[PDB]
Amino acid sequence: MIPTIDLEEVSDKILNQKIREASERWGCFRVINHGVSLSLMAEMKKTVIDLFQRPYEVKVRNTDVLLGSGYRAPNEINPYYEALGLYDMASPHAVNTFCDQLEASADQREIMVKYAKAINGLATDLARKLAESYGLVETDFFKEWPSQFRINKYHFKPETVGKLGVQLHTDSGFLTILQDDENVGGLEAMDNSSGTFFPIDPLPNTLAINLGDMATIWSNGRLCNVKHRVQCKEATMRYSIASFLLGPMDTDLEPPSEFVDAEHPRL
Ligand SMILES: [Mg+2]
Secondary structure, X not given: OOOEEEOOOOOHHHHHHHHHHHHHHOOEEEEEOOOOOHHHHHHHHHHHHHHOOOOHHHHOOXXXXXXXXXXXOOOOOOOOEEEEEEEOOOOHHHHHHHHHHOOOOHXXXXXXXXXXXXXXXXXXXXXXXHHHHOOOOOOOOOOOOOEEEEEEEEEXXXXXXXXXXXXXXXXXXXXEEEEOOOOOOOEEEEOOOOOOEEEOOOOOOOEEEEEOHHHHHHOOOXXXXXXXXXXXXXXXXXXXXXXXXXXXXXXXOOOOHHHOEOOEOOO
């Protein structure tokens, strides 16, 4: 069962411990009182629905920077899935480039810029809190790590009902912040101690956090890179916004020394 964590918990040591234990045992958690404007989130979702209605030949202009960071149309691999996105979402130039490509209106440009900075602010706060929950000295470990923005459109038709939308996976980055569709949902995750699945329902004004492959590597196996998938529950349209804190660009990432020792051998 995925825990919900109150980011306005007054005690840092209780908050950090709750974050750490969620992240170790389940690899994901929900946050409430996250500090992100609710109206900004709703405005982002409307912008997303609108960006996906852009002419096809406009969407194809969303070109890759990292492989897969740009536009993807549904195909025979992922029949129900369409996506747009941008690499280095912490860079205002990257965000504007994306807005240029998709012919974002002025308002839409500003929504994106303010969403990017808010969500990215939250991601770096959660990352610092994870370092704090371990009592690490490297409380700035994430500061040269790029983030990636991806917006998704799921199209489920009546034949899809009762089966999966996209199949089971782990994210490859460090941490992911998901603004899921409050009206649809169906995200599910594997409990590694039983193989049983539990749901991550879209509770309104909340965000879903999950950890990825980079977090397990970084914490030398302690953080759970959770396995998850989205199941189709009804033939409908579903929109989600994902923000990925990735690992290092350049460098090949290994763990802070504190994590590696005789009882926790290196990986
Ligand atoms: Mg995922």
